[model samples]
Target: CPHIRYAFQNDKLLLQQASVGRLTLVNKTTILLRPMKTTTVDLGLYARPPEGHGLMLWGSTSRPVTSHVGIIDPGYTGELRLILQNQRRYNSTLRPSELKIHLAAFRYATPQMGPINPGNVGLDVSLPKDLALFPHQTVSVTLTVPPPSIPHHRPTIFGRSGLAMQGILVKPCRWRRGGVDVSLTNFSDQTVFLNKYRRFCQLVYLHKHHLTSFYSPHSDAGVLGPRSLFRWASCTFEEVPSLAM
Candidate 1:
């Protein structure tokens, strides 16, 4: 079962007195790593695969590699591939039994609400809350995109599909007094990937009932189903906007 838990950044998650395991250099330098919890990372490689990749976690950083964990999440933590290139230019070789990776620490997401009772929810049936927006009022949001140059090194274990772009609606702009309307539109010619929906955090400004929400021009929130055109969300504030006296 998926752990119904989240953690914030810099939260003390797990501690280890020793290493998870050890790795050796193959034809190139293949790194061995171990993680106790979820991670977010960017593989400093040339090309990332459209599909996902696989890796193993170890119990300690020693000879012969022991206690292996399977299939590292692409979005779990940041890692790099450091294989020796230009074989003709440099005379070097690496062994798999001699490679080692350190813990490097971890960050946990905020704890989610509890399981469904009379006022709770279970794992599979749970969803994030929709942010409230006022009628004709705009909210500013930030969209993150990876640099195009990240795909130069073809990462074997993990690929480009692991790279993530998250959307968050910053707060202080919540509607305390007004109605809201939501809409969706499309404008692209190619198909895109519809991953999942999330309620992001952000900030905004409201002046004299002439509210305007700011958003990025390079936003990638149009990922719907299998095409990248446009997508949207909805919210309803409990209160109505006051009149501009």
Candidate 2:
């Protein structure tokens, strides 16, 4: 497991406050910051994640604060303080019992670059109506890939942080011949709204050569399952300029 160290001004005092339940809000800062007023939490500690891993600072999932997401780059040695804010009409509480911010460390593998590089691409689908998604309701959209002239590169889709704060989860489906499908689900009780043609998601491209290991199997036997074999055999292959070349 990964851990983050914290430095306290007075460990004894902090502990005492915690014991007596007097620590309702640990005001790391001197003044009571209002909504949109960003403050830093000074935890005199260092953060070290496992190799090939990094720490991503996000608002607490259970008890989230109105703040933007922060990324702690690997090898960051400064004091581990959270830069947070309040984005509501009411004031935010920082009780010791409930955490308003959290850090997640995730492992990742390095991607090797290929000869072709696809630049930043936009989402292919637009909201048909005044998009409103209720809790558990999902909406699927097709994302267009770059044309053949641009060369095929892997694309990673991500949802906006502002929407994520509203409990809107964006899920990318498997790639198909024409494009990819993305599903948006509302996880919060309230409904989430979106405007047509508004930037709801982001598309990032990566070198396709590095991802060959992910899609290609060591042997042909491992390439497809019985169902996949049937689909592959029955699928029609239209003659395309890219394939002809």
Candidate 3:
């Protein structure tokens, strides 16, 4: 009998399996996999992305996560399978060779902050009934911040999970003087109607007292609302050669 090793540790389940062959899809037709139910195939074995590249498995950007996205850990050795949920009355499609997945290469670092109360606040801005977003259209919304919000901690913005499934994304930005501006982009093909007074984004507050202990040794008062912390750069994607096994 063939079986896969399964174990639970630290609140996560681990699985071990071996790959057989590539799962190839023919025609333009699609297969639907329900929530908690999975469809498996003997597809190509999974491999880690090249150095500096993170192999991310994501759903349709146009449809967002209408169908859940699954991740393939680096150096995974097993059959390629897709587990998805409709989450709606309509069905989702899996295009041949397209896989409906996206991959990006990036790196990041984390810094420790002193302990302080963390507050989760929702954006005060709402969409008007008359306003509808078309595919690829971008809208800038000004967010309202609570008064007396000290700069001890910086603000990080994120899109509402449900809204993201509708092909809506909130461009991350830091809240600062003159108010913070967020860009909402519609990636779907059809127009998306926005519900009035709906919460579309969330802002997390990190208090300043938590970081003072770490900064007191080197700097005074810790740099508050520094412009450098909000600066970002853009990158482009190009094709690269792959090695054959």
Candidate 4:
């Protein structure tokens, strides 16, 4: 090793002239992410770096920053996956743009309800006092329901649960000013007592597309990928501060 070291060959610069093994941006399965949709795409490439080095990602294809928003470590011989956020009103198919993706960092929205939170959409509804239903009776009932901490989307209160209550068909009420326009009906011949604090319904926050559309129901295929392991530099141990809407 010292013998070749003494020769002092500038392979650092000499190897620069060589192009035997390099990367190419071959177009394959080119997908046009529908306007305003955030999804991941397989770039059909793999990076195998040295043991001590890594691959960094920078801005590309009009994307201003890395979503790893970090790096692909050495020896991770896997296909390159990228988060392609069509953070635009314009379409990729409708508006063509140049690709400027650099492989490696250096470093890392208002929040438009960032990720679609399926978990935070629904909450249990409770009644404070005892109530009863007579035979063949339908009662028009409305209750004051609190909104979710994040009120970016429309809040809807739906009747469901232990009792087969028929809620009026705005599927779930548009829940205005802490209220749900619900109708509770008992179709059977028996008189029933709905006890106090009965969690017989749920409150759900919905996107604009969901509010009056009940007939359309389908399942999405892909699962959400792993989010980053980074943590916020917060002063508090708990994050339960009721945020202002």
Candidate 5:
């Protein structure tokens, strides 16, 4: 009968098999392990980044600049190097006092006699292969800017302040395809420290459409009242990236 032995993130599970392993406090730590049967192991380590700075590792002359080291094997363990160096502008370093290591064990035995792959287990495992999958090219989007005039009647004042504004899709002067994007910003320097209240609001297309006897999802019971100041607003229309034929 086949059973799940264990599953791991990495290939070498050396630490996973070792019954009692000890890591000494030195520039390098070593662990011994012995495996009786063929098994897969996953070894993962969470290295702390430099407290206020960054930690850099050493390499041979050929690969001297690179600081990252790959995983070690599961069956054999030896001197694991921690060639940590401080690379912060300020005076900061990593202290052994704040260092700790954690470990766990599990067993997996499955009938599928093969390596675990994302596709085999229906998992999102692969990285995007082609960077050029979606070719980059300047696209001229045709926008549909509506006319400035209101659909049926004139703009009405609503709400607390007597401000008449509507969220109408302003079409381009000539074109009926390309859409326009409008933006608004508040550049006021008024400060209300205490005991003051200023209301700012704006009318949008849905609000105007519904106000002008247009069908909408919900009814505007008392949301937009008379004499209300619909603060500055903006409207926009975006075109499809790829137009349909």
Candidate 6:
């Protein structure tokens, strides 16, 4: 009989690349990105989680589209920054929309010290249905893929979703296994179809701490988690103190 050794949170991690990007910061330009690239973003918002809890944020950029999602440290009085990537081919356009950010707070009450081992994380998950877009129209579409067999945790991690970032459509796409629901904008004068089985987005597994760990994929220090955090901290309480300028 042939088999492998047994351990908890100690399985073979999937092959992947690490983040060579700059850290996410507030009140600073921090970093800039190009087509098919990623950067850390400061949303200028403020968050005040409890002393022992953290805030987890999942955000989607609009218009030109950028993927802004990550965590804010526990009880952090810092600005709310996010991991934004231009998963498109053209220059990304940032919009002043208040609707893109999604917040959820979490505490590793029964903390699992993760030496987070990954598995066969498939990024090539495809669309289950055909999608159609008319010129200048943006629609929120849903597609389903097999859920991860790997157990323990899910970070709601980010992936190069919008497979083509194409369809002659623009993506400010966002994801989670509840289903891959992404917003695609038809920028051309014609209609675009995101047909079935055509891979629209990908899937990966990361712990709550990974997004905030310096030693993790991104190569930068933890921004937020339990030790750093996977929840909201602060920022976007932009204009304060002064009544007027």
- Residue range 115-208, candidate 5, lDDT tens digits: 1111111111111111111111111222232323434322221111111011111111111224432211111122111111222111122222
Regions of model 6 farther than 4 Å from truth: 1-122, 144-146, 155-180, 188-190, 210-245
Alpha carbon deviation, residue 20, candidate 5 (Å): 9.8
Give lDDT tens digits, candidate 2, residues 71-180. 34556655455444443435566655443334434333322330112211223334434577865567777656432322544444444445655556554322445776
Residue-wise lDDT of candidate 3 within 1-245, one digit each (tens)? Answer: 11122111111111221122111122123445333222332222243333322222223323322322232333444444333333333444444432333322212211223011111133333443335777667777765543235444555454554555566666555556567776776655558777666666655443332223332222222112223221111123322223112
The model with the greatest lDDT is: 2
lDDT of model 1 at residue 216?
Answer: 34
- Candidate ranking under lDDT, highest first, comes to 2, 6, 3, 4, 1, 5
22-82, model 6: which lDDT tens digit per residue? Answer: 1122121113345544444545445444334444455433344444334344445545545
lDDT of 4 by residue, 1-245 (tens): 00000011211111111111122132223346544334444454444443223333322343421122113444445555555444344555312223333342111101123001222224656656676766545565667644544444455454432243221111234566756556555543457677767665555443333233222111111111121111111111111122111
What's the best-to-worst order under TM-score? 2, 3, 6, 4, 5, 1
In candidate 2 the C-alpha lDDT for residue 41 amounts to: 55
Candidates in order, TM-scores: namely: 0.16, 0.38, 0.38, 0.34, 0.18, 0.36
Q: What TM-score does prediction 2 earn?
A: 0.38
What is the TM-score (0 to 1) of candidate 1? 0.16
Q: Mind sharing the TM-score for model 5?
A: 0.18
Query: lDDT of each structure?
Result: 0.20, 0.40, 0.37, 0.36, 0.19, 0.39
Off by over 4 Å in 1: 1-103, 107-109, 114-245
lDDT of 3 at 144: 58
For model 5, the superposed segments whose C-alpha errors exceed 4 Å read 1-73, 81-92, 108-125, 130-245
Looking at model 5, residue 86 earns an lDDT score of 19
